[PDB]
Structure formats: C-alpha cells, structure tokens
Amino acid sequence: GAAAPYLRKSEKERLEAQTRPFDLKKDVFVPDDKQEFVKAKIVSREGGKVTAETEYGKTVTVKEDQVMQQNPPKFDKIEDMAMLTFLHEPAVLYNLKDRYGSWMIYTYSGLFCVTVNPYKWLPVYTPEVVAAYRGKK
Amino acid sequence: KSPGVMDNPLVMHQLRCNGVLEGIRICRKGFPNRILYGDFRQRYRILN
Amino acid sequence: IEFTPEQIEEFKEAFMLFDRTPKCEMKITYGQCGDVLRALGQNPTQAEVLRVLGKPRQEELNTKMMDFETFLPMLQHISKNKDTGTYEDFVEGLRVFDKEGNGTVMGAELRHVLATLGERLTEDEVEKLMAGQEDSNGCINYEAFVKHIMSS
C-alpha cells in the first residue's frame, strides 16, 4: 500500500531490476561465523555431496541436507513477514537483523510481532502519532 | 546494555530460539487485524 | 426552468436571514452556502456545495462572499438533482447488519457506523442521537429508527 513517515518502515520499496537475473536458480544458504547465514552457489553436485562456494569465493565440499534454498529479495525490508516464501532458518535471520538496524524495532511477524529492544527514548510515542491513530483505517 | 548496537552471534542464536521460524510459517496467513462482521457488513452496504 | 413567485419568496426569506451584519450588506459566505440550501429544502453533500463555489476554497470561513444575484444562479442549478433518496434504500441497507433475523441493533455497533465513513458525524452528535431511554445491554431497532429520521 501507500507509505507514511518513520513509524512504518521504508514501505514504498523499489523493485531494483539488478536483483532479478539472480533467480536462476541454484543459490543457497551457507553457515558463516561473521554474519551467520550467507549466500552460496551450487557450482557442481557430486550426487549426495556438493561443491558450494560462498560470497567469499572459497570452494567447499558440503553434504546435501544443509543446503537451505534462497528466498528472493522480493521480501526485503517490508512491514510484515507474511510473504517470505522459502521458510528455512536463514531466510528469516537476515531479514529481522536488518529491520532493527533500519530503526524499525517492532515488526509484524503476524499478530505475534517481533520487537528488538532499542533501549533509547525514541520520539515515536508523541501525540502526533497518538492524534492520527484514533480508530484509524 | 548499549543502545543501537547489535551482535550477530547472540541474535543468530536468539532467532533460532524464540520459535521465530515456525512462528512465521503459521503466522504468515495469521490475521493481525480482527473486528466484527456485523459492522463491516453494515458499514460497506451500498458499495455494490 | 426558472423560479416561481413562491420559490423566490422562499429564497429571499432565507437569504435576508443570513445577512448577519450590524449595518447589513446583503451577502452570504461560501461556507454558509451549505446550511442555506439545506434550510431551502434541497439535501446536498458538501461535495454538492463546493461544486457551486466560485472560489476553490474548501470548508474554511472568510474566503468569498456571494450576492443574491450570484446565489440564485446557484439555487437554479441545484434544483436539477434527482437522486435524493427514499425510505426503502435505507431499509435494504440497514438490514445487512443482521445475523439471526431480528432487525435489532446494539448501541456500540450503531454509534460506530455513524462516525466512520462518509461526511461523518462526531462523538458529540452520537451522544445527541442516543440519550436513552431505559433499555440495557442494549438494543435499538431498524424500523422505528429510520422513520423518525424521515419524520424529522
């Protein structure tokens, strides 16, 4: 829908075409220490064993079952969570970490929302916000 | 206890720990808006 | 179409009333164009009011003044409207609330529909619309309600 100022996230998101040619189609999530879960590519599959690199290019032999499928940036920095498709671990992990940092503490993960405590008197709780929100649509 | 700062090792673990994954797997269709049907019917009426 | 001797008197009376001045001048504000026409008997939306406003002003007081020479070409235009409403549109409409075929309406559910969508009423006007008496937990009915509205 249509955006507001910083109460919502940057919900007038774009669809930057750069990201599109990536949906083709053998990229996966590898475990890292630095960020946690990152992006890898299947280069060659030895049947049950795989040779999957990473963002850092180091080529590694892996076992099939670890390979979590990539969940496209079609769900990057939106309000709710709902639409995130391939629901394995890292697909969620990345998305919330960058939500908190992007100043949006609270987030819709359905009704049972997620908040990552800011610890700071953020100027959101002012009666400007509490003037608009009177049984609002 | 620091404002704005985040750690990855901690958050890594915590998102795995608060059943957040499975939590989004159901609460992706789970309605966060919920009111009364009598009202919404009466309030929309002559749109059609 | 043009105004009859009876209609000209109706327009003159209301307009002369609207002239509120210690020294008089014979003008109406564009804002007051609302309730004028209403007292004249024509039932318009604020959309209908602003539609015949010389100035693209919206609601405020202290923009433009209109003479009777200007006001009449307003009235003469307004008379054309056909869709004013009946009773039976409202009966069909208000029946939609039902769940068990009772035609009965709870107080909270009834106040909310008045406030929310449209030109809208306020909290205050709801307090006026319902001030009793002596029915708890806490129902009105659709038939008697509408007929009192039309009755005035």
UniProtKB/Swiss-Prot annotation, chain A:
Record's subcellular location: Cytoplasm, Myofibril; Cytoplasm, Myofibril, Sarcomere
Residues found modified as N6,N6,N6-trimethyllysine: K120
Chain ranges of the Myosin N-terminal SH3-like domain: 23-72
Show which residues constitute the signal peptide.
none
Other remarks in the entry = The cardiac alpha isoform is a 'fast' ATPase myosin, while the beta isoform is a 'slow' ATPase.
Q: Which family does it belong to?
A: Belongs to the TRAFAC class myosin-kinesin ATPase superfamily. Myosin family.
Q: How does it assemble?
A: Muscle myosin is a hexameric protein that consists of 2 heavy chain subunits (MHC), 2 alkali light chain subunits (MLC) and 2 regulatory light chain subunits (MLC-2). Interacts with ECPAS. Interacts (via C-terminus) with LRRC39.
Q: Which disease is it linked to?
A: Cardiomyopathy, familial hypertrophic, 1: A hereditary heart disorder characterized by ventricular hypertrophy, which is usually asymmetric and often involves the interventricular septum. The symptoms include dyspnea, syncope, collapse, palpitations, and chest pain. They can be readily provoked by exercise. The disorder has inter- and intrafamilial variability ranging from benign to malignant forms with high risk of cardiac failure and sudden cardiac death.
User: What the record says about its domains?
Assistant: The rodlike tail sequence is highly repetitive, showing cycles of a 28-residue repeat pattern composed of 4 heptapeptides, characteristic for alpha-helical coiled coils.
What does the function comment of this entry state? Myosins are actin-based motor molecules with ATPase activity essential for muscle contraction. Forms regular bipolar thick filaments that, together with actin thin filaments, constitute the fundamental contractile unit of skeletal and cardiac muscle.
The identity of this protein, by name, is Myosin-7
Originating species: Homo sapiens (Human)
What is the organism lineage in this UniProt record?
Answer: Eukaryota, Metazoa, Chordata, Craniata, Vertebrata
Tell me the part of the parent protein that is shown. 10 to 146 of 1935
Curated annotation (Swiss-Prot), chain C:
* In-chain residues carrying the UniProt-annotated modification Phosphotyrosine: Y87
Keyword Phosphoprotein: yes or no? yes
Look up the coiled coil feature and give its residue ranges: none
**In its UniProt record, which GO terms are filed under biological process?**
cardiac muscle contraction; positive regulation of ATP-dependent activity; regulation of striated muscle contraction; regulation of the force of heart contraction; skeletal muscle tissue development; ventricular cardiac muscle tissue morphogenesis
Q: Which of the residues bear the PTM Phosphothreonine?
A: T45, T84, T86
Q: Does the keyword Hydrolase apply?
A: no
Modification Phosphoserine, positions: S136
* Keyword annotations from UniProtKB, A to Z: Cardiomyopathy, Disease variant, Methylation, Motor protein, Muscle protein, Myosin, Phosphoprotein, Repeat
Q: Which GO terms describe its molecular function?
A: actin monomer binding; calcium ion binding; cytoskeletal motor activity; myosin II heavy chain binding; structural constituent of muscle
List cellular component terms (GO).
Answer: A band; cytosol; I band; muscle myosin complex; myosin II complex; sarcomere
* Residue ranges of every copy of the EF-hand domain listed in the record: 6-43, 85-120, 120-152
Post-translational modification note? The N-terminus is blocked.
Q: What does this protein do?
A: Regulatory light chain of myosin. Does not bind calcium.
Disease annotation reads: Cardiomyopathy, familial hypertrophic, 8: A hereditary heart disorder characterized by ventricular hypertrophy, which is usually asymmetric and often involves the interventricular septum. The symptoms include dyspnea, syncope, collapse, palpitations, and chest pain. They can be readily provoked by exercise. The disorder has inter- and intrafamilial variability ranging from benign to malignant forms with high risk of cardiac failure and sudden cardiac death. Rarely, patients present a variant of familial hypertrophic cardiomyopathy, characterized by mid-left ventricular chamber thickening.
* Subunit-level organization: Myosin is a hexamer of 2 heavy chains and 4 light chains.
Would you tell me the protein name for this molecule? Answer: Myosin light chain 3
Source organism: Homo sapiens
Please name the gene that encodes this protein. Answer: MYL3
The range of the complete sequence contained here reads 44 to 195 of 195
